[PDB]
Design a binder for this molecule. Structure first.
Ligand SMILES: CCCCCCCC/C=C\CCCCCCCC(=O)O
Length: 264
């Protein structure tokens, strides 16, 4: 039954996420090749094709860094929708009280986002806009403060995460395990969530044993990555709060504002 459950989770991941690691690698390797964004000229060209409404405002267009942050938020909002549907495949999740489902997704979505971002990142840049753009790591570092500080820790995480050489069958189970953490603040049926966590982590552990016979510590490596992601999210939320307080034009989408509210 555990092998079947691993396959169910993998299939739910392939169905519900618009991007997966095979699809990303095909694009990153070289009919609609990605438009490369490496400077302000190519950002503005890319926007006019890929997000035309955002730059259709003349001198009322927002600052480039704020437009970029807006596009970052749109990607998060979409990934939150995909993760919410994916979670239905996790045994026990749909049997939880609605409020506990909300809490698990609230704390888990950005850990899952940054884990899955690794699949579209290499040391030079990342895919964006449903695989139709590639924005360089150096360009994002070139942005004015504080916006240059958003992505670099995520690239740092991803380079090490990618060196583990996971595939989508592994990542799907890892994302399921992120969602099933019984120590999230405010949970009301901790006991049932802990059993749900134990079950998915057992599936993950057996799958990694089978799929990565060469790396006998891969399961504890991934437990550590889960803790590293929690710290990355706490730090990310702190930076978002700086942006919120100090950048009046960088409006936060209400769904993400609710995720961040009372989080850490
Ligand atoms: C014209 C395309 C412009 C693309 C800009 C870069 C898009 C980056 C893609 C995904 C960003 C992932 C990080 C999201 C965290 C910041 C936003 C948030 O807190 O939700």
């Amino acid at each position: 039954d555990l092998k079947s459950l691993a396959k169910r989770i993998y299939e739910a991941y392939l169905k519900n996420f618009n991007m997966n690691k095979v699809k990303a690698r095909v694009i990153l390797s070289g009919n609609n090749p990605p438009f490369v964004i490496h400077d302000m000229e190519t950002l503005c060209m890319a926007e006019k094709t890929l997000v035309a409404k955002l730059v259709a405002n003349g001198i009322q267009n927002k600052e480039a860094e704020v437009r970029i942050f807006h596009c970052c938020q749109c990607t998060s909002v979409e990934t939150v929708t995909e993760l919410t549907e994916f979670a239905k495949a996790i045994p026990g999740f749909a049997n939880l009280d609605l409020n506990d489902q909300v809490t698990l997704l609230k704390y888990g979505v950005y850990e899952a986002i940054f884990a899955m971002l690794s699949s579209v990142m290499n040391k030079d840049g990342m895919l964006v806009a449903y695989g139709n753009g590639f924005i360089t790591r150096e360009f994002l570092k070139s942005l004015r403060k504080p916006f240059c500080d958003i992505m670099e820790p995520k690239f740092d995480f991803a380079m090490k995460f990618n060196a583990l050489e996971l595939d989508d069958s592994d990542i799907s189970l890892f994302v399921a395990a992120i969602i099933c953490c019984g120590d999230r603040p405010g949970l009301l049926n901790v006991g049932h969530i802990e059993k749900m966590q134990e079950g998915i982590v057992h599936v993950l552990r057996l799958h990694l044993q089978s799929n990565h016979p060469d790396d006998i510590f891969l399961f504890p490596k991934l437990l550590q990555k889960m803790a590293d992601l929690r710290q990355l999210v706490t730090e990310h939320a702190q930076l978002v709060q700086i942006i919120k307080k100090t950048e009046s034009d960088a409006a936060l989408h209400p769904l993400l504002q609710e995720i961040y509210r009372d989080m850490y």
